[PDB]
Write an enzyme that holds these catalytic residues in place. Structure first.
Site, PDB file in Angstrom:
ATOM      1  N   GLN A   1       0.837  -1.188   0.000  1.00  0.00           N
ATOM      2  CA  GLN A   1       0.000   0.000   0.000  1.00  0.00           C
ATOM      3  C   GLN A   1       0.875   1.242   0.000  1.00  0.00           C
ATOM      4  O   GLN A   1       1.999   1.235   0.509  1.00  0.00           O
ATOM      5  CB  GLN A   1      -0.923   0.017   1.217  1.00  0.00           C
TER       6      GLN A   1
HETATM    7  N1  LIG Z   1      -5.517 -16.222 -10.043  1.00  0.00           N
HETATM    8  C1  LIG Z   1      -4.252 -16.022  -9.372  1.00  0.00           C
HETATM    9  N2  LIG Z   1      -4.231 -15.278  -8.118  1.00  0.00           N
HETATM   10  C2  LIG Z   1      -2.954 -15.052  -7.394  1.00  0.00           C
HETATM   11  C3  LIG Z   1      -1.787 -15.543  -7.905  1.00  0.00           C
HETATM   12  N3  LIG Z   1      -0.797 -15.211  -7.085  1.00  0.00           N
HETATM   13  C4  LIG Z   1      -1.320 -14.518  -6.060  1.00  0.00           C
HETATM   14  N4  LIG Z   1      -2.649 -14.432  -6.270  1.00  0.00           N
HETATM   15  C5  LIG Z   1      -3.912 -13.879  -5.678  1.00  0.00           C
HETATM   16  O1  LIG Z   1      -3.981 -12.593  -5.879  1.00  0.00           O
HETATM   17  C6  LIG Z   1      -4.522 -11.900  -4.510  1.00  0.00           C
HETATM   18  C7  LIG Z   1      -3.486 -10.972  -3.951  1.00  0.00           C
HETATM   19  O2  LIG Z   1      -2.379 -11.696  -3.422  1.00  0.00           O
HETATM   20  P1  LIG Z   1      -1.711 -11.144  -1.992  1.00  0.00           P
HETATM   21  O3  LIG Z   1      -0.523 -12.055  -1.577  1.00  0.00           O
HETATM   22  O4  LIG Z   1      -2.777 -11.160  -0.874  1.00  0.00           O
HETATM   23  O5  LIG Z   1      -1.168  -9.583  -2.202  1.00  0.00           O
HETATM   24  P2  LIG Z   1       0.198  -8.973  -1.520  1.00  0.00           P
HETATM   25  O6  LIG Z   1       1.345  -9.249  -2.384  1.00  0.00           O
HETATM   26  O7  LIG Z   1       0.410  -9.587  -0.185  1.00  0.00           O
HETATM   27  O8  LIG Z   1       0.012  -7.350  -1.319  1.00  0.00           O
HETATM   28  P3  LIG Z   1      -0.903  -6.746  -0.106  1.00  0.00           P
HETATM   29  O9  LIG Z   1      -0.661  -7.630   1.178  1.00  0.00           O
HETATM   30  O10 LIG Z   1      -0.445  -5.284   0.209  1.00  0.00           O
HETATM   31  S1  LIG Z   1      -2.724  -6.724  -0.594  1.00  0.00           S
HETATM   32  C8  LIG Z   1      -4.763 -12.848  -3.655  1.00  0.00           C
HETATM   33  O11 LIG Z   1      -6.204 -13.162  -3.666  1.00  0.00           O
HETATM   34  C9  LIG Z   1      -3.944 -14.055  -4.147  1.00  0.00           C
HETATM   35  O12 LIG Z   1      -4.553 -15.220  -3.793  1.00  0.00           O
HETATM   36  C10 LIG Z   1      -1.797 -16.325  -9.223  1.00  0.00           C
HETATM   37  O13 LIG Z   1      -0.763 -16.755  -9.669  1.00  0.00           O
HETATM   38  N5  LIG Z   1      -3.027 -16.546  -9.926  1.00  0.00           N
END
Ligand SMILES: Nc1nc2c(ncn2[C@@H]2O[C@H](COP(=O)(O)OP(=O)(O)OP(O)(O)=S)[C@@H](O)[C@H]2O)c(=O)[nH]1
Ligand SMILES: Nc1nc2c(ncn2[C@@H]2O[C@H](COP(=O)(O)OP(=O)(O)OP(O)(O)=S)[C@@H](O)[C@H]2O)c(=O)[nH]1
Ligand SMILES: Nc1nc2c(ncn2[C@@H]2O[C@H](COP(=O)(O)OP(=O)(O)OP(O)(O)=S)[C@@H](O)[C@H]2O)c(=O)[nH]1
Ligand SMILES: Nc1nc2c(ncn2[C@@H]2O[C@H](COP(=O)(O)OP(=O)(O)OP(O)(O)=S)[C@@H](O)[C@H]2O)c(=O)[nH]1
Ligand SMILES: Nc1nc2c(ncn2[C@@H]2O[C@H](COP(=O)(O)OP(=O)(O)OP(O)(O)=S)[C@@H](O)[C@H]2O)c(=O)[nH]1
Ligand SMILES: Nc1nc2c(ncn2[C@@H]2O[C@H](COP(=O)(O)OP(=O)(O)OP(O)(O)=S)[C@@H](O)[C@H]2O)c(=O)[nH]1
Ligand SMILES: Nc1nc2c(ncn2[C@@H]2O[C@H](COP(=O)(O)OP(=O)(O)OP(O)(O)=S)[C@@H](O)[C@H]2O)c(=O)[nH]1
Ligand SMILES: [Mg+2]
Ligand SMILES: [Mg+2]
Ligand SMILES: [Mg+2]
Ligand SMILES: [Mg+2]
Ligand SMILES: [Mg+2]
Ligand SMILES: [Mg+2]
Ligand SMILES: [Mg+2]
Lengths: 163, 163, 163, 163, 163, 163, 163
Positions: free
Chosen positions: F56
């Protein structure tokens, strides 16, 4: 004189059936394995201590408690289940990279060969990427736990890696 | 008084048959050797302890567990199989370079001489590159495990390298 | 008693295959080498510690981490690949000018000689500019990692430069 | 009680054959010597430690690793090869000027005398410029490693230069 | 015990080849010498430290950096090149008048005598005006760096002017 | 034996999912990362200590607290998000200019390759200006944290930059 | 043991590319050089410290800050750019008259020889008025920074002017 084994695999494979076909000689009715079963079976003056565990997605994360002091592993794969052969490949490639199972011998029971749609041991050897194994001894045997075929030929191979 | 032996070779050679022709005196029916067989046979006041092992490609990588404390080796080669005489040469030249078998005596059973298409012991001595051996005593004998010919003449030579 | 080796080359050459043909004796299936493999192999009472590394353009810049304390180098070149023999020459002439490899012995495995279009070791010796080497011992051997030919004749030469 | 020897020469001369005719007593089949062979042979209460090395053009530059602490040298020359007697003269006049071999005794095995076209030891003594030697003891013997002739008469002369 | 040498001449003469025929004993492939090569060679309990330099017109002006503390000079002249014998005379008469090389011993390698059109050492001694030398010891030797002839007879003469 | 890693990127990339796919082996449900997660994962006898942080806009200014003593960095980029590839370029070019990350190794997980509209690793390598990197080792891998593809091939590359 | 270098030229010449082809071995993507880059590269037991600077008209007036304590200069000229060969001549004749670069060695990289319309090194030697140089050593080499040709032959010449 002694040996420790860990039977693992996906759900529906045949682990419990294999174990209680080796231990009792009869095909028992089965319930999903939430916890774990442990049984000692003697063969060739060797006492294998087999630990059968659950394959449900929720128990696949508890297998780590058993990796320690494990001298052999028996990965059971359902041959009729040709739609989950990729999930088994993921699980096995993940569990081959663990350092507690660094010296463990690998045996693969391609079970449910009595079914007509069963897939050959070579097709499984190709789909599982078993030739890619280089840090480990490995072997694949075709079985039928309901009839006992190929079960005493796996414990026979595990004897090669004694002590 | 004692001696340790390791019988090895490719699949189909005649290792198990040789062993249980020396030990029992009868030609037994055979199954592929997945694990290992071990048997003591007495001759000339000497007790040879022979370890017969598998020749399948998957077990040829487990022979190393047995190289240690091995005083003699018996390489069995199928003479009728004239298409795999190069693979046997590879295996033998690899296993002659191991340091655990550094002092081991070498004996070669050219088996299946009863078959019409069998190849002579000199043709095998040439194809296997046996004269190239220089760090080791060696000997080649023509056999027929089904009839026992040439089997007690190999244990007789192994006695030369006692103690 | 000991010796350190660095196996290098372009992508597709045969480094991993050579290493696990020396170490295991079998031809394994292979994946691109992103990281590194390290394996000890014994021969002639000497324990070579071989480090196989990646050849992708992105990993060729990380080889420098391994130049230090390296007593021998094994440059593997694909003979069938007659279009990248200039890139290999660039890489080798660059790595011969490094001061950490100042005393290292040079061995060249001209691999993939089993292929019909393979190029001779003398044609490679001319294309790689190997006679131009003057500050270093060098040697070129023709191999076939799938069959093991010429592999134990390279470790034999590396023994000349022991201690 | 002890003595160190270095057997050298061009390719095809007979070094390995001489060594394993002295050590074993039998004529072994041979492969080109890429690395080195080392063997101890006893005679007249003296234990000669002979180092046979390669003669290929690529290994002739690695002989320097062995010059040190060398008490005798055995230069083997093929007599039938009358076209390379000049190359051997170059090699020997180069290796006589090295300071590590300053006190070494010189022996010359003019081998392959069993062949009809073989050249006499005096013709070789003239072609090699052996009378030009002044800082060194020297001797030339006519041999036949396949029959053992003249081999035990060289170790007998090397005994003169003991301690 | 020690001696410093400067090998110089025109381009194409044979300086690098001479140096790495003395140092290694083999005829190496060569590239034009843009910078400089330096190598120590032992002979007669003396360690000559030879500096081979470029002969291209652009590097002939950088030789002055090396004149200092130079105890001997080796001027290599191509005998087959009968069209540039005047340019070599200019270079040598210029470099004989320098005061840093005031006590240096002069040796002249008339190289490439193996070629049919080669010119004798006396014809070169006349064309180079070598008898005109009066403040300096001098000597001319006929060579063939590819065969080593006349090379160890120059270092032998340079020993006369030791210390 | 040990290594410290910092996983960073924009929001929605896949950092937490990657971390708990490496650590647990299962795809967890996720909440936005306001603080930080830290987890140790073992692989190849190495214990990576990964710090996953928020992406964020309000937390991107707190990453500086973690730059210190960081040996590797893992920049995760959502490939489906083709509208924010410029913002990621800004963030990465800003964080490459920091002096605390001066020696850090750079790895780039181009995640969400399972989606149809995903963009290739080369298109990302061009859009992110990765070839412009000159003071740093770097590497880009195509992944799918939901399936584990390409995740163990990044930790494998990070091993190249050990110690 | 050490040496300081200043790489200069007009914009578009190839200075940064040359530097990071010598230092890394790979062809990096480039941005206009507003400031300066500095990198140490080892070769022939010498550690050159190269300072690459901008060629834009606005930075050509800041080169004076670097003239001091500079032991060599590398003027890179684009050969394909036949319309700016006069501007380069102006710049070089101006910078040859500075007293801080009074003893500096001059090297000229005529880069971009891989292009079809490239102009020869002699045509450049004539257009740049290089023979007019009299207070300075000088040299011109034809290069291709994308392929590395002629780059290690310039550092080789710079070694002539060591200390
Ligand atoms: N369809 C799909 N979804 C993915 C993949 N890799 C990660 N995600 C999905 O995308 C969403 C975001 O991943 P997330 O790990 O929660 O974000 P972040 O990198 O931690 O960043 P944040 O915490 O500031 S929101 C999640 O719902 C996760 O399950 C992928 O390879 N394919
Ligand atoms: N037809 C046939 N059924 C088999 C065979 N081997 C095992 N099974 C059957 O398949 C079913 C699943 O075997 P089971 O041993 O209970 O699964 P599991 O390996 O223990 O995994 P779980 O405990 O997490 S449900 C059982 O009904 C069993 O009897 C076979 O070779 N042929
Ligand atoms: N006709 C004939 N058959 C022989 C002879 N010697 C051995 N055999 C037969 O050849 C077959 C293979 O012998 P066997 O001992 O089972 O192979 P192995 O050496 O043990 O190798 P494996 O266990 O990995 S399959 C057997 O059917 C055996 O009876 C012989 O001399 N003549
Ligand atoms: N037909 C044939 N294939 C060979 C031979 N030697 C090696 N190979 C094959 O060529 C392929 C490449 O060999 P490999 O060892 O995986 O490349 P590498 O040297 O490790 O380089 P990389 O890891 O960066 S992809 C493999 O499929 C291997 O089996 C040979 O002698 N003959
Ligand atoms: N006919 C005959 N052959 C001989 C004699 N001495 C040696 N040889 C033969 O000549 C061949 C070359 O001898 P060998 O010992 O292998 O060469 P080498 O000295 O070791 O040199 P290399 O190892 O670099 S190939 C061999 O086939 C050997 O048997 C001899 O006296 N008479
Ligand atoms: N045929 C023949 N060729 C010789 C002889 N001596 C030297 N050469 C050859 O002549 C060529 C030039 O020799 P070389 O040593 O490379 O020149 P240089 O003295 O170093 O001068 P340069 O480095 O400025 S190009 C080479 O190909 C070399 O092999 C000889 O005696 N006979
Ligand atoms: N085709 C080709 N391009 C080259 C060659 N050498 C350098 N270049 C290319 O020409 C372009 C300019 O090179 P560059 O190094 O960035 O300029 P500069 O010398 O640093 O000057 P600047 O920083 O003030 S813009 C680059 O795209 C570079 O890749 C060559 O030999 N052949
Ligand atoms: Mg169960
Ligand atoms: Mg058997
Ligand atoms: Mg590889
Ligand atoms: Mg030999
Ligand atoms: Mg030269
Ligand atoms: Mg998160
Ligand atoms: Mg620039």
């Amino acid at each position: 004189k002694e040996m420790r084994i860990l039977m693992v695999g996906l759900d529906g494979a045949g682990k419990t059936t294999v174990l209680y076909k080796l231990k009792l000689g009869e095909v028992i009715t089965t319930i999903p394995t939430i916890g774990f079963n442990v049984e000692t079976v003697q063969y060739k003056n060797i006492s294998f201590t087999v630990w059968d565990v659950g394959g449900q997605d929720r128990i696949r994360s508890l297998w780590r408690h058993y990796y320690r002091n494990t001298e052999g592993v028996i990965f059971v794969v359902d041959s009729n289940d040709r739609s989950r052969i990729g999930e088994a490949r993921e699980v096995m490639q993940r569990m081959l990279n663990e350092d507690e199972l660094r010296n463990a011998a690998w045996l693969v029971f391609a079970n449910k060969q009595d079914l007509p749609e069963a897939m050959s041991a070579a097709e499984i050897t190709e789909k599982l990427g078993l030739h890619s194994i280089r840090n480990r001894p490995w072997f694949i045997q075709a079985t039928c736990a309901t009839s006992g075929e190929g079960l005493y030929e796996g414990l026979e191979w595990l004897s090669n890696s004694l002590k």
